[PDB]
Symmetry: none
């Protein structure tokens, strides 16, 4: 994965945001994104710009006409994918079209870089033919300003999730926080999620780099932590004391 060398282009993936946070803040994260599977083909949006005349009479040597860049447009993105009405992601796509709210969608190139736009579905189609797979074709009109893949350009990642083990004694409505950290001294594009393995003895309220546990019942259970896309994981045990 070298973002400084030409890439063949195969393996490009497409995801749609469904969370509530800032899509532009953590685009490399894949936590609140649903993948659209089996994209037959994809053509991304085009960044256009309407020109404005910038030539007045007072200017000398008026033989040549001059223009300047005005308002920029993000263009329309098209993609056709295999038609599976019963697969999660297509149902969300038609719900998005029927509602019409502006949502964020990103494309993960086979380069270690992502490209996320915001837009709404402007066209929905279908191509049913024998001797060939049925393909659903979607067109999306982008709004606002996109987050180009050339903006961040400074991704960092190393090996490991440090997390303090044990944490046995758990009392007072439990509700204790346990410290988590990354290996590259902390400086990365972070992403992670955790949840109790049983949910009958304890539950978690992960919010902002701190994992807080509150328990309901006694027993031994281990909570997992998964690094967003999941390139690393960790496990920490909890033993709910009677008193």
């Amino acid at each position: 994965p070298n973002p400084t060398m030409p890439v063949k282009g195969a393996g490009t993936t497409l995801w749609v945001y469904k969370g509530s946070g800032d899509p532009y803040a953590n685009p490399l994260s894949d936590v609140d994104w649903s993948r659209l599977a089996k994209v037959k083909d994809l053509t991304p949006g085009e960044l256009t710009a309407e020109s404005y005349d910038d030539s007045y009479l007072d200017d000398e040597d008026a033989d040549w006409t001059a223009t300047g860049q005005g308002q920029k447009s993000a263009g329309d993105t098209s993609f056709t994918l295999a038609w599976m009405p019963g697969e999660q992601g297509q149902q969300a796509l038609l719900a998005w079209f029927n509602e019409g709210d502006t949502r964020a969608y990103k494309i993960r190139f086979p380069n270690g870089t992502v490209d996320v736009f915001r837009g709404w579905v402007s066209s929905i189609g279908k191509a049913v033919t024998a001797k060939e797979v049925i393909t659903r074709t979607v067109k999306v009109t982008n709004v606002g300003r996109p987050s180009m893949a050339e903006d961040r350009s400074t991704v960092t990642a190393a090996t490991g999730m440090t997390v303090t083990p044990a944490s046995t004694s758990v009392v007072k409505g439990q509700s204790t926080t346990l410290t988590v950290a990354f290996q590259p001294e902390g400086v990365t594009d972070k992403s992670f999620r955790a949840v109790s393995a049983d949910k009958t003895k304890a539950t978690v309220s992960v919010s902002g780099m701190t994992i807080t546990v509150n328990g309901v019942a006694a027993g031994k259970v281990n909570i997992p932590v998964v690094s967003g896309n999941g390139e690393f994981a960790a496990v920490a045990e909890i033993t709910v004391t009677a008193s």
Copy 2:
């Protein structure tokens, strides 16, 4: 007939509603529907929406243009069949064109799902050529809200997730299979992924509801399996033996 997998599109049929009840209620029944047999080519109408400008003079970030989804349209659906005027149903189609009253027509795909639209015939053509069959081409302009296939999809999920624990026999390359199954009445959307917490003593090879786990160096690794729902997870314990 699995709606969660792509289909070859061969065998798609077309029906026109003839009864008096509501077609939108039960479009899976072929009671009051007339079949238009011998379909040569078919192309369903595309769903489209007109864009309405959403740019205000007093807002910031004027370097880019923004718009929004406006009014949807159901497009024009075309299909060419063989010319058999004596066959009932073609006469009904011609009478529908002559009277010009809006009616419902459904398409049966080889998935068990249907596509029922409402519209009026706006074009009737013919192509007479030697060494070829005489074809009748029909085009229907659709009105109102079409009943898409994805509106007939129901979701079954939750109730947790299960995986067989321990199985400490880890020796000589392993590639041991780990089975992850969902409890609720069989039917569910089984989206999941599992991750190795060490990546050195042992590794996982997630592949379609079966986890392939191999060992490299002796030690104790607990590997977590989580789900895309964001609530369900479990941890399986592995002891990679040197010999």
